[PDB]
Design a protein around this ligand. Structure first.
Ligand code: 3YH
Ligand code: CA
Ligand code: CL
Length: 223
């Protein structure tokens, strides 16, 4: 997260860290045994880390649970970035508490102009590299489709939306991928891609979760 702030320990209790010997992506807990993340974060042997604040210190409140299934959307396309969503099933159900909590799936798509909360342990620099110990947060608005398209040098699909600030300085970044965008208490986005981070007229792009609610429910029910 570039140009954000320290969330505060466990203030985003649905935020998870995907770990393969180090933190590499975020995710969102949607029930006690399933996490929503990005298809492009797929790796085998993922450990999901719940209840984290400082990802480098055992503070208490952590639950580390291996992924038993990592289900990439069948229509994920790594060139076009369409359908950048993956569902991770936890080997065992997490013990839900105040610091480890699910986030609601949407019943309708979020409204253009709404200010949403993006979070993660990704790079905090727009140029160069600095990774935080503790969870970072950024509030930013959903931009119009027309604005997103005008900003982007890449083809935007109906399964993407953009959120951020066109003046630059405020964005998700590397290592935030797969983590949440929450709008009015609903998980509306997954950190997906952007042209660099926090550059002028290059806002962040996010998987549009409201398009996948039926798919998510069906896939969970059958697995
Ligand atoms: N600024 C962000 N919000 C953000 C979030 C996560 C990662 C990165 C990021 N940090 O460094 C690079 C990045 C990156 O995502 N690059 C990138 C650019 C374009 C595409 C893309 C989008 C749509 C269609 C096609 C493409 S592609 N795959 O042909 O380039 C994909 C990835 C930035
Ligand atoms: Ca920790
Ligand atoms: Cl820090």
């Amino acid at each position: 997260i570039v140009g954000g702030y320290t969330c505060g320990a466990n203030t985003v209790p649905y935020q998870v860290s995907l770990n393969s010997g180090y933190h590499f992506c975020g995710g969102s807990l949607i029930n006690s045994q399933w996490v929503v993340s990005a298809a492009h974060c797929y790796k085998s042997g993922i450990q999901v880390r719940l209840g984290e604040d400082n990802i480098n210190v055992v503070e208490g409140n952590e639950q580390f649970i291996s992924a038993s299934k990592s289900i990439v959307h069948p229509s994920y396309n790594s060139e076009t970035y369409n359908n950048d969503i993956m569902l991770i099933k936890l080997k065992s159900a997490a013990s839900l508490n105040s610091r480890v909590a699910s986030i609601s799936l949407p019943t309708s798509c979020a409204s253009a102009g709404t200010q949403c909360l993006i979070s993660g342990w990704g790079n905090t620099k727009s140029s160069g590299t600095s990774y935080p110990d503790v969870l970072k947060c950024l509030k930013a608005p959903i931009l119009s489709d027309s604005s997103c398209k005008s900003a982007s040098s890449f083809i935007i699909t109906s399964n993407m939306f953009c959120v951020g600030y066109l003046e630059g300085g405020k964005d998700a970044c590397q290592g935030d991928s797969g983590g949440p965008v929450v709008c009015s208490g609903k998980l509306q986005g997954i950190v997906s891609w952007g042209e660099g981070c926090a550059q002028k007229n290059k806002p962040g792009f996010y998987t549009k979760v409201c398009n996948y609610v039926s798919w998510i429910k069906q896939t969970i029910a059958s697995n």
